[PDB]
Design a protein around this ligand. Sequence first.
Ligand SMILES: [Ca+2]
Ligand SMILES: [Ca+2]
Ligand SMILES: [Ca+2]
Ligand SMILES: [Ca+2]
Ligand SMILES: [Ca+2]
Ligand SMILES: [Ca+2]
Ligand SMILES: [Ca+2]
Ligand SMILES: [Ca+2]
Lengths: 389, 389
Amino acid sequence: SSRRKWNKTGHAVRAIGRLSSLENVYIMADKQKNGIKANFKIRHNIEDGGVQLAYHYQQNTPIGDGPVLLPDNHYLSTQSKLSKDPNEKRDHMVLLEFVTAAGITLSKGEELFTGVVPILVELDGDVNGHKFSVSGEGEGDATYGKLTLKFICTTGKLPVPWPTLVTTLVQCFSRYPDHMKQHDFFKSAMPEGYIQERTIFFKDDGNYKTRAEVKFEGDTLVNRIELKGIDFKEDGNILGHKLEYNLTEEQIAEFKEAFSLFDKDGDGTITTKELGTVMRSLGQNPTEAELQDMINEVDADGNGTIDFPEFLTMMARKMKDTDSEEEIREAFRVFDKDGNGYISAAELRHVMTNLGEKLTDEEVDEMIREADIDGDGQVNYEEFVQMMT
Amino acid sequence: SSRRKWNKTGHAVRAIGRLSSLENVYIMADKQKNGIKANFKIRHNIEDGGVQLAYHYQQNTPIGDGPVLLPDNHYLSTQSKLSKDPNEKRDHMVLLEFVTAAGITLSKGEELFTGVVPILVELDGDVNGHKFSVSGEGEGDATYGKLTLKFICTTGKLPVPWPTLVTTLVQCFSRYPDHMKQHDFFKSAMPEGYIQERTIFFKDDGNYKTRAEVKFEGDTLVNRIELKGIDFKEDGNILGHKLEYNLTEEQIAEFKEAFSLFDKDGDGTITTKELGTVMRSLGQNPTEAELQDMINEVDADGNGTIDFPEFLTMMARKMKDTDSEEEIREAFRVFDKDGNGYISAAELRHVMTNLGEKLTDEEVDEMIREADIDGDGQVNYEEFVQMMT
Ligand SMILES: [Ca+2]
Ligand SMILES: [Ca+2]
Ligand SMILES: [Ca+2]
Ligand SMILES: [Ca+2]
Ligand SMILES: [Ca+2]
Ligand SMILES: [Ca+2]
Ligand SMILES: [Ca+2]
Ligand SMILES: [Ca+2]
């Protein structure tokens, strides 16, 4: 009962804490500057416990004179994965990010982002008088809100933690859903680009002030940055390097490929028509209303289609092991078209061809080879589970 | 690479399976019958693997002559927990359910469901000529979409598994959010009630046909049912009893109490005004726009307020142990108002009184007693974690 009073109070306090933490980037029009503002907080994990908050204040303004889109209030939701290159000796950061715009119910610059776009990033920094430089390269694919970059400190040892520079180191690569296209400032300013300025306040420590020019140089999207950091504590979490660094990337890549089977027109979203096409190809013929009911359950932004992050969340929504086992039993039954307990090379071929894969008979045979443990030329349920687990 | 082809194909097949399974109750108007229809599938777990599907077809029609509400298409989402009474020797089922209506963007009978309502359930059944009876009693609170019932087989051993009778054994207790009040058929038909008829098809087995009268008898909501089952297999999953039976209920009760601290007017939903009130009481003063941003992140139905199931999902959204540990560190800091590392009886009192609890100084002291391991009269961080973990 005293225990119950503590728990109930504890839960209420913890609820406020969960409601209170949003790391989303909140964007508003700044009509006087013909651009936008944003504000957001980043929570950096401290090694062996604690969070280091970083309060961001952002403004963006067009470089060029052409008209730009000024948005209604909305936000960007980002998921970042930081990693290392095992064959890299230089101080470095490998980065994978997916960003999508949301927060709103229901340009010529956008044509520049229909496919994969090469990116170069250059940063010249000075933190408490420690000068440093970073260069990065990779690619953006705004269809999926996706960025893939590697960064190198070109001046030796980076004097601050890599995660503190992530937000500084191309919001033009955000995926803005179809109903929000008129609110995408960042692409509207292209190719001439925009200036992005921030102040980033590290609580109980110093701050960064940043100015960047984001624009096309040829077919490359370039982010050239100046950063000045002042007032940092020599044994704070930043100059003292006390911050933590970091689905796998392999896993996400598999899910993207799987997503691509549904997203027939490659626009980064699955429609009821696309889902129906795939289901019909495997012999199931739900009605339009049934297909919408299915999409609705996983359609977190309520725009009526499934984007890749929503697909990801569905496929990452962890299950009871016993549900996981039954889902694999069900998938086996889909592959085993005649129900005899064995997936044949003909059956495998049929499922892959219908989902939209193109494979030779020889490639289908190699798939059976990897799975076929007892050498009968087919894949039974035990062998299927081993392939899938 | 063959491994990758299997995985990517497997994921696509498993995605269709996840999209395809919806156990939601889909409701449509049946204007010719002055009532509604529904259809849905229930997935019953089979002991040691497999699912037994049960396809439901439902119609409801008013008993009385008064006008009723006929809805636009929507659905009910339910979460059920089945349990046993340790001091019960009779064949029985204890049941806890939360049901909420959804699927739509943005009556006098409803007045009968503003508080807790007693429920009686009576079922007379015949499955493959095995006659049986069930009686149940409990309470519904439609404010939270909540049902709490205990059922007893009054004829001895139940000849079918309890989980197969759940849907048969009061959708008037569903929580219809404010924007959907005009689509709540079930309460609109009260007090005179409605007739609910189903056929339930157990795949590869027999079926139940059911007819029920749901109505008020005095202040009690009564569900009186006739069930006939035919064509069941003697060693199928139903007559062979091969189905599985079953947050804890304690846990959910704690979360409800915590929810109640926010839901000041007891209407079962937390508004920005309510959340602001609680946050202000603990010293934080977010703006209306900030409070809406907070609610939006957890507001799965997009109606702008947090209902109890949404609160539950937020508080059940499992975390990395290290995030869990930091959330407890943060909660400690909230209780420790002067930051000295110790929660005093005065500080505890202040937090509870401000959240809206009413406690005597003696009750606050007993809380400190349970937590205070080293007898200094206050609660340090180590003691707090033990109380909270
Ligand atoms: Ca598409
Ligand atoms: Ca969507
Ligand atoms: Ca076969
Ligand atoms: Ca084999
Ligand atoms: Ca309320
Ligand atoms: Ca809501
Ligand atoms: Ca204190
Ligand atoms: Ca103590």
